[PDB]
Every structure is written in C-alpha cells, then in structure tokens.
C-alpha cells in the first residue's frame with residue numbers, strides 16, 4: 046500500500062478542528078444521526094471495545110453511535126494489557142507486527158519485593174510472555190489505542206463523535222422499543238443540543254458513572270482503599286545500572302513493599318503529533334494489516350513518524366499504588382509543591398532500592414499538556430450496585446474498578462464490554478419484535494446473568510487485590526504465595542481456541558483466576574492473618590511460615606488436579622514444572638532482545654530481522670528463541686502451529702475454560 050495523506054490534507058484544506066477532522070471519517074457523516082439502535086456514552090477503551098465487538102460479532106445488524114466529550118482521544122492512565130487483549134485485537138484483524146508499531150512490547154510480569162526493615166534486601170518473581178510466533182502483550186498509550194479503535198470502528202460501520210457530550214440532565218432512557226432520546230451537546234454552554242432516538246444506551250463513561258450513578262449510590266468495600274500518584278519519565282537504552290538483578294524493561298515491572306507497589310511500564314509516546322497526521326498513520330497501518338504486509342517490509346515506528354510528520358519518543362510510566370491507611374508526615378514541602386509530587390518523592394526516599402532505581406530516570410515535564418507532570422487519584426476501588434435497566438446497561442469502569450495491579454481494568458473489564466456487545470443484538474431485536482411489556486420482561490430476564498456476573502466480579506477482584514497487597518508485606522509470601530497463586534489460577538488455558546463467537550463466554554470465565562476455589566481459600570487465610578498486624582509492623586516470621594506451609598499444601602493437590610500441560614519451569618523463573626519453589630533457579634525461556642541502536646524491546650522470530658521501532662537490521666541475522674528446557678524441532682513447530690490458525694467455531698463443541706481443572 047502506498048501511504049495516503051487524506052486526513053492531513055483535508056484538515057488543512059478546510060482548516061478543521063481536531064473534532065471535525067475525526068468526525069469526518071464517520072460512515073454516516075460528521076453530524077449526528079437522528080436515530081440509532083445503540084448510543085454509547087463515552088469513547089474510552091471500553092466504549093470502543095463494545096462497539097467494535099458488537100459490529101464484528103454480527104455485522105450490519107445494529108446502528109451504533111459513540112459519543113465522546115474529548116475533542117480528540119484523551120490521556121488515560123491504564124497502559125498494560127494481557128494476552129486476552131492481544132488475542133481480541135488479533136481476532137479483530139490486527140496482529141503483533143502492526144500493533145508493535147504503535148505500542149510497546151510487553152513480555153510478562155516481574156515483581157521485586159523490598160524488605161522494609163532490612164533496607165537493600167529484596168527478592169523477586171519473574172515470568173516471561175510468549176514466543177513471537179505465538180503472541181505478544183502490549184504497553185499502550187491510551188490516546189493512541191483509542192485513536193486506533195476509533196478509526197477501526199469507523200471502518201466497520203460505527204460512528205464515533207468526538208467533541209460531543211451526552212447531557213444526562215435532559216437525556217431520557219426508557220424501555221419500549223425505541224424508547225431513548227439521548228440529548229447530545231457540545232457542552233454546558235451549548236444552546237442547541239441534538240437528540241438521538243434510540244433503543245439501547247450503553248454507559249461507558251468510566252469511573253464517572255454518569256448514568257448508572259442515577260440508579261444507585263457508589264458502593265465502597267470494607268477496609269482500607271488505595272491511592273495512586275504517578276508521572277512520566279525517560280526510558281534509558283542502558284538498563285544495566287538498575288539495582289535489581291536480571292531486570293528487563295519490557296516486562297510490566299512491580300516494585301512491591303508493605304505499603305503498596307510501584308508500576309514501571311516502558312512504552313512509546315506519540316504526544317505532540319497533530320491528530321490528522323495520526324489518523325493518516327493509523328489508517329495506513331490498518332491498510333497494511335488488511336494486505337498482510339510482512340513485518341520486515343512494514344515501516345518502523347520512527348519511519349512512520351517521518352512519513353506522516355509525527356512526534357515519537359520512549360517514556361517510562363512510573364506510579365505508586367499504596368494503601369490509604371499510610372501515615373504521612375504533616376509537612377511534605379521538602380519534596381515538592383503539589384501533593385502528587387510530594388508523596389511520590391517522599392515514598393521514593395523511604396526505600397533505598399526505590400531511590401537507587403529512580404536515579405536511572407529523568408522526570409518528563411507535562412508530557413500530556415500543562416499540569417500533567419504529576420497525577421494523583423484517591424480512593425480507587427468502588428462498585429456500581431445497578432449496571433442495567435430498561436433501555437440501558439453499563440460496561441467497563443462504569444461497573445466498578447479495583448486497582449492497577451495485574452491490570453484487571455482493561456483485560457478483565459473487557460469481559461463486560463464484549464458480553465454486553467453480544468447481548469445487544471437480541472436486546473434490540475426483542476424491542477423491535479414484541480409488545481412493550483413483554484419486551485421489557487424478556488430483556489430483563491436476559492440480563493439477570495449479566496447483572497449477577499458484575500455483582501460478584503468486583504468483590505472477587507477486590508479480594509484478589511487485598512490478597513496480593515497483604516502478601517507484599519513479606520519477601521517470601523509475595524513471590525511464593527500471592528504471585529504463584531495468581532499465575533497458577535489465572536493463566537489463560539486454551540486461549541488459542543477462542544474466536545469472535547466464543548470470546549465473551551471465555552472472558553467471563555477467566556476473572557484472572559480470582560474465582561478459583563483453592564485461590565480464594567489461600568487468599569482468605571492470608572488476609573485473615575495479615576490484616577491483624579498493624580501496617581507499621583513487620584509480619585512475625587512464624588506467621589509467614591504458617592501461611593507458606595498452608596499455601597503449599599493446598600497448592601500441591603490443585604496442581605496435581607490440573608490436566609493442562611504447560612512448561613511451568615520455562616515460564617516461571619523461580620519454579621520447577623510442578624510449581625515448587627526452587628531457591629537457586631534462574632533458567633527460563635528467552636523470547637525477547639533489546640535493540641542495540643534505539644533500546645526498543647523486540648520479539649525473537651526468524652522472519653523479523655529488523656527492529657520494528659527504529660528499523661535497524663538485526664545485530665546478527667540469527668538470534669532465535671531459547672527454550673529451557675529445550676524443545677525439539679517438531680515440538681517447536683507444533684507450538685507455533687496451534688497459535689497461527691484461529692478456529693472457526695463449531696456450535697456443538699463446549700468451551701474449554703481458562704481456569705484449572707476441578708479435582709472432582
């Protein structure tokens with residue numbers, strides 16, 4: 046495909062604002078339609094996942110309009126994604142060669158547990174991702190992911206309107222076929238709002254809960270909650286002075302300690318780029334995806350920036366997520382003038398390993414515009430008691446949220462977005478095909494499982510979060526109990542069998558393994574014990590011994606009962622194939638390398654000889670995956686064979702679940 050500059054030139058020719066050039070790519074036009082089947086409030090990641098999955102699940106069945114008040118895709122925290130998300134992107138026609146042009150490579154999750162009373166001591170928990178010929182995970186800049194999904198939506202019959210706001214004061218949502226009149230304006234000041242007559246409203250307004258907050262007060266869980274404060278930093282090419290042994294930048298790294306943890310995410314940023322130019326670059330990437338352009342013949346990220354006149358840079362997202370029962374000194378003026386900056390810098394100097402770590406990074410001022418050097422958000426976790434009703438349902442953060450840890454926000458949250466998407470087809474058809482009372486009753490009964498799933502989802506995630514947090518109070522419980530159990534219960538078994546048809550059903554059965562009985566049993570034992578130790582104290586060594594012994598007794602039987610074959614010793618650096626902790630073990634598979642030219646992390650596969658980020662040809666044209674223990678040529682061919690082909694679904698075979706096999 047020859048690159049086209051359609052939007053850059055259209056924007057200049059008509060002197061178009063950001064919202065106008067974006068809305069000009071809509072299939073039905075730049076102005077709002079008088080009527081639609083579904084109106085989606087909000088074009089965050091979940092509103093767009095919803096609209097994309099709905100249209101892809103059953104094309105040309107629903108007219109869908111998405112309303113977003115930002116003038117262009119705005120900044121969001123929430124950058125780490127997991128295999129289920131990549132698989133969804135691949136099922137929607139965008140595989141790793143194209144996604145890696147826009148987003149950062151992610152190869153697994155790594156944890157470092159810092160001893161508070163023994164400053165300098167630490168342990169770790171390492172895990173790898175997958176070979177390049179299997180899949181990739183992604184670190185995504187959210188203005189770019191939401192641009193990507195906006196353009197892809199517009200190319201699949203979905204209209205997306207930026208710079209437009211749902212007026213929840215005058216909007217009417219009812220049952221009865223085409224019962225909704227969604228009022229859309231350019232803002233409070235706008236005297237001439239438009240109405241979209243529609244059947245179904247989707248609340249995808251995130252934590253603002255702009256519609257469902259009208260139906261039930263926000264619900265908070267018992268006990269402590271969390272606060273987060275964060276900023277953006279340079280990303281060094283040379284990672285060798287990082288004070289943690291075997292550190293690698295292409296993991297989602299976790300620096301864990303009694304009060305909480307720190308995320309470290311390496312990702313590319315497109316900030317400074319005009320929106321029209323970005324639209325042209327994304328459109329070009331999609332055309333290359335459609336045409337199946339091989340990765341080595343696809344321009345590198347930096348080459349795309351030159352082609353389309355973009356700004357491109359490597360940044361590190363670094364933030365704290367800590368309990369809100371931490372005692373702070375009253376006066377923190379020595380660490381800055383803003384509260385976020387003050388508590389960030391205060392926490393860094395409380396741990397010598399954090400300060401030595403942060404000394405590798407340079408602060409970036411105002412990456413996302415003025416006032417954005419530092420961010421703070423208080424009291425993270427919540428749940429919406431009511432997530433559906435006549436004429437509407439809620440998805441994503443609008444249903445509830447817990448914590449950044451293990452990234453449930455996007456990767457678990459998309460189970461609601463995609464299930465709601467699948468359900469929207471019968472919901473709309475019912476309303477077109479039955480009298481009003483029976484339509485309302487049938488739709489209500491159809492959504493009972495959706496409501497019940499959401500109701501129990503966030504509490505399970507909250508228990509999962511507390512489980513990890515309390516275990517992070519000790520450098521043995523963190524890696525040997527909490528991390529081990531999260532990955533044993535939550536690894537995505539049979540992900541290679543999922544397709545568009547079965548995606549939502551698979552996704553709602555995952556929950557990061559937080560529903561697995563043996564997981565909840567260990568989690569409850571640890572929480573019950575550790576929550577009785579005041580935060581400012583060290584856990585008694587006998588308590589750690591007892592919890593570790595309890596966890597290991599439950600583990601051996603649950604592991605024996607799993608019938609899923611997996612080279613555990615190759616994936617978890619510190620564990621053998623039966624998930625026993627091995628004190629000296631360092632052997633692991635190696636799926637990635639760092640580009641010597643630009644520092645970008647790359648996936649090892651023989652058909653990708655050039656760095657996908659800067660284009661530098663491979664340091665030597667023969668670095669291949671290292672399997673430890675080794676795999677034969679046939680076993681390696683077999684692994685790849687299972688993941689290149691996506692299966693058309695048979696309506697008869699039952700879905701294989703991601704969670705471990707029941708002992709029964």
Ligand SMILES: Cc1cc2nc3c(=O)[nH]c(=O)nc-3n(C[C@H](O)[C@H](O)[C@H](O)COP(=O)(O)OP(=O)(O)OC[C@H]3O[C@@H](n4cnc5c(N)ncnc54)[C@H](O)[C@@H]3O)c2cc1C
Pocket residue numbers: 086087088089090091092112113114115119121122123124125126209210211212213249250251252253255273364422425440441442443446448449450451452453454455456458
């Ligand atoms: C500190 C922190 C770290 C996190 N880290 C991660 C991570 O690593 N990985 C992960 O997966 N998740 C992470 N999360 C969670 C993640 O940020 C959220 O789960 C996710 O961004 C929510 O997506 P959403 O589409 O539901 O809502 P949002 O992305 O918040 O989008 C809601 C949208 O609604 C729009 N809107 C609001 N009102 C109106 C209106 N009246 N009319 C029109 N539009 C409107 C807004 O403009 C916005 O675009 C993190 C969260 C926090 C707080």
Ligand SMILES: CC1(C)c2[nH]c3ccc(Cl)cc3c2C[C@@]23CN4CCC[C@]4(C[C@@H]12)C(=O)N3
Pocket residue numbers: 128153154172173174175176179532535536537538540611612616684
């Ligand atoms: C299942 C998978 C998506 C996964 N999900 C994880 C969750 C937590 C942790 Cl710690 C690791 C993983 C992995 C690594 C895996 C293990 N599988 C071995 C055969 C194919 C595959 C897929 C992939 C692979 O190559 N790497």
Ligand SMILES: CC1(C)c2[nH]c3ccc(Cl)cc3c2C[C@@]23CN4CCC[C@]4(C[C@@H]12)C(=O)N3
Pocket residue numbers: 464467549550696697698699700
């Ligand atoms: C298991 C089932 C009740 C189910 N439970 C779901 C929950 C959420 C979502 Cl999104 C979908 C489903 C389905 C669809 C299924 C899948 N099964 C294939 C063989 C028989 C059956 C039963 C049924 C079938 O025909 N359709």
Ligand SMILES: [Cl-]
Pocket residue numbers: 125126127154297450451452
């Ligand atoms: Cl993660």
Ligand SMILES: [Zn+2]
Pocket residue numbers: 640641642643644645656657658659660661
């Ligand atoms: Zn490079």
